[PDB]
């Protein structure tokens, strides 16, 4: 005799039906026939017993606010069997509202519809009187209504815009009502921002796919698994990205920024990857809009490499040489930023429009000053990004030419006035980076005499040289010899006693602007000889030392003398005119400082 049925279960469907399912006799090695009686204590009481060979049954068009008592018995299907006892009756009580379906879980832009059975005083009202509201806000437009039956009313939503949140809820609430009076139960519309832009990037070595996406929206409904789904089409991305039936999951790892990142190696450089996010929920499943990516199109450009900067020979231009990055092989324009080497770099930009030019040249103000120069490249069509700046290129401090100008020198007299041969001590000063390039190896004093002729004496790096002047006329020139050669411009100063008495200054005056500022003016006589410049000699009046000189152009009547003068000591200022034929007769004045 068969065992009475066990595990009776029954559920109200989305389409407003009832499905009854129960556990069969596992121990029975023979088929079973099931008599299931339902007592519908609805607005109309209907007790009816149906027969099923399986464990499933359906009842259609449920009446709202109704009881249901379900009973099941079983029997041996084959042979002279005996019907078993009833199972446990179970009682359902329906409510005033029936939904078709209760809930929908979907994405943006879909088409979602509901139907309603509204009871009122056990009278199923006309569908013309059933009207919906979304979370008790406003009446759905009439064009979105429909009548499946006079009792089953219908509402439709096309072009579903994503449900912008209202509090912690993740859905729109819905009640369908007999206009002004209706029931407690609430229908849920789960729509979220499913259009997501997962940003995928190729590594600079073309061995890695890294994909990041921020799930800022999904972390509001719980109990749903989330994963990355993808497929690989053989070559390139079809213009319509869609989910091919074969799909595969990818494991991904969360980071601190709240983004999930997915790491892929090795990479198919030309296979198109159709990718999306799968969200498996109890209600159903959602998928983000499939997007196809081709790896070579998301490659971060690589910096130019093997960068050396050097000052061009005999021109002073900044030549920068580099090697093209391995990828991509397409034509690239180069933006080169450059400036001085230091804490602050006055970045200026050079534009190179041909890829084959692995080296270029630019203009700089200083020709041995260290610089910081970097290079970046972009694809010619602009399809891509800007590569990282190249290795900072530095320029070496080295002379490129011969020096431009020789040092300024002046004479000091040693010996008595009467005796002919006097010790001329030529004192010059070290040359800055404006005329001496950036270094000088030595100074050479080239003489010029009517008796001994022209001879050059090397004094090395010294700024002084004492030589015995003997002849009535003696020109002397000073040349600054660097690692490459002698200075181009070189002042020539002649010594001559007959022209040592030639006066070229009418008047000389000095005023103490400050302790470190002595302001000097002079009026010069009409000069017959070829005058190059003048030499200001200032010293404390009536002393042997303190002797100091500067080279003034003869074209000016001004000179600022900036020196640590002693206020209590009066200073003797001597202005010496310089001619081709010889040093002229000075003008000597005395003034305070």
């Amino acid at each position: 005799k068969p065992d009475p049925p066990l595990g009776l279960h029954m559920e109200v469907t989305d389409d407003g039906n009832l499905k009854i399912s129960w556990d069969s006799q596992t121990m029975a090695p023979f088929p079973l026939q099931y008599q299931v009686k339902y007592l519908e204590n609805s607005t109309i009481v209907r007790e009816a017993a149906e027969i099923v060979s399986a464990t499933s049954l359906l009842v259609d068009s449920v009446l709202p606010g109704s009881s249901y008592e379900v009973q099941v018995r079983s029997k041996r299907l084959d042979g002279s069997g005996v019907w078993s006892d009833w199972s446990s009756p179970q009682v359902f009580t329906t409510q005033d509202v029936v939904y078709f379906p209760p809930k929908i879980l979907t994405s943006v832009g879909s088409n979602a519809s509901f139907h309603c059975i509204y009871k009122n005083e056990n009278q199923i009202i006309s569908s013309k009187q059933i009207v919906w509201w979304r979370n008790l806000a406003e009446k759905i437009p009439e064009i979105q209504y429909s009548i499946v039956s006079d009792r089953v009313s219908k509402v439709t939503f096309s072009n579903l815009k994503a449900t912008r949140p209202r509090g912690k809820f993740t859905y729109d609430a819905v009640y369908c009502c007999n206009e002004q009076a209706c029931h407690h139960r609430y229908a849920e519309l789960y729509v979220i921002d499913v259009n997501i832009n997962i940003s995928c990037e190729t590594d600079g070595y073309l061995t890695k796919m890294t994909c990041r996406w921020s799930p800022s929206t999904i972390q509001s409904l719980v109990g749903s698994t989330v994963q990355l789904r993808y497929h690989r089409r053989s070559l390139y991305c079809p213009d319509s990205p869609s989910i091919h039936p074969t799909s595969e999951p990818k494991n991904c790892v969360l980071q601190r920024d709240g983004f999930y990142e997915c790491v892929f190696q090795p990479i198919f450089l030309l296979s198109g990857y159709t990718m999306w996010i799968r969200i498996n929920h109890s209600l159903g499943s959602l998928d983000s809009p499939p997007t196809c990516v081709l790896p070579d199109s998301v490659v971060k450009p690589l910096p130019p490499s093997n960068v050396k900067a050097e000052i061009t020979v005999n021109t002073g231009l900044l030549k920068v040489s580099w090697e093209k990055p391995v990828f991509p092989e397409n034509n690239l324009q180069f933006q080169i930023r450059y400036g001085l080497s230091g804490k602050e770099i006055q970045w200026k930009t050079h534009e190179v429009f041909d890829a084959k030019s692995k080296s270029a040249s630019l203009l700089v103000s200083d020709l041995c000053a260290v610089y910081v120069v970097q290079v970046r490249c972009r694809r010619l069509d602009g399809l891509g990004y800007w590569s990282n700046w190249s290795s900072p290129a530095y320029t070496l401090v080295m002379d490129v030419k011969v020096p431009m100008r020789g040092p300024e020198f002046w004479r000091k007299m040693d010996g008595d006035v009467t005796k002919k041969e006097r010790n001329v001590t030529l004192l010059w000063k070290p040359l800055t980076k404006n005329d001496s390039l950036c270094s000088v190896r030595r100074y050479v004093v080239k003489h010029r005499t009517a008796h001994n002729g022209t001879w050059s004496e090397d004094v090395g790096n010294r700024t002084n040289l004492t030589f015995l002047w003997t002849e009535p006329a003696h020109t002397v020139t000073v040349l600054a010899v660097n690692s490459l050669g002698a200075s181009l411009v070189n002042f020539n100063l002649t010594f001559s006693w007959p022209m040592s008495k030639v006066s070229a200054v009418e008047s000389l005056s000095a005023y103490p602007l400050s302790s470190s500022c002595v302001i000097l003016s002079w009026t010069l006589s009409p000069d017959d000889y070829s005058l190059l410049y003048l030499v200001i000699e200032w010293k404390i009046l009536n002393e042997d030392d303190g002797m100091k000189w500067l080279r003034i152009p003869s074209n000016v009547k001004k000179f600022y003398i900036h020196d640590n003068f002693i206020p209590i000591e009066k200073y003797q200022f001597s202005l010496y005119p310089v001619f081709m034929e010889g040093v002229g007769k000075p003008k000597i004045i005395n003034g305070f400082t």
Partner: protein, 140 residues
């Protein structure tokens, strides 16, 4: 000993405070307070609460309802409701008058969201009504 004016001001400040704090929960402000919903008739919603004993039994029922909902914010609001009920007992003591002192699970289980949103907007209404009649000589 007990300054009654301080108690009226603290009562008003606490009522206004609870209503605004619950007012920061955005989804309830857009829900019609006066709309009738069949099934939650046991919740003492807008139905003239015109006596001290009716206010007391109303807040007692509201306390019993809030006690079963598992949210922390509502638990403290329920604590404030406790301070308020004890305060109404102190006010009745001030005016001299005695004050004496199930189906929630079914609606909580079948429709918790609807029950909560309505229960809360009705609570806000009850406090707004008591406030609107806490000056027209309240009587026991």
């Amino acid at each position: 000993g007990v300054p009654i004016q301080k108690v009226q001001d603290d009562t008003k400040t606490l009522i206004k405070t609870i209503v605004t704090r619950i007012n920061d929960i955005s989804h309830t402000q857009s829900v019609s307070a006066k709309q009738r919903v069949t099934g939650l008739d046991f919740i003492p919603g807008l139905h003239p609460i015109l006596s001290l004993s009716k206010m007391d039994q109303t807040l007692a029922v509201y306390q019993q309802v809030l006690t079963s909902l598992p949210s922390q914010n509502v638990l403290q609001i329920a604590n404030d409701l406790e301070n308020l009920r004890d305060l109404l007992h102190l006010l009745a003591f001030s005016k001299s008058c005695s004050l004496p002192q199930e189906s929630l699970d079914g609606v909580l289980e079948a429709s918790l969201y609807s029950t909560e949103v309505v229960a809360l907007s009705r609570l806000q209404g009850s406090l707004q009504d008591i406030l609107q009649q806490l000056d027209v000589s309240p009587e026991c």
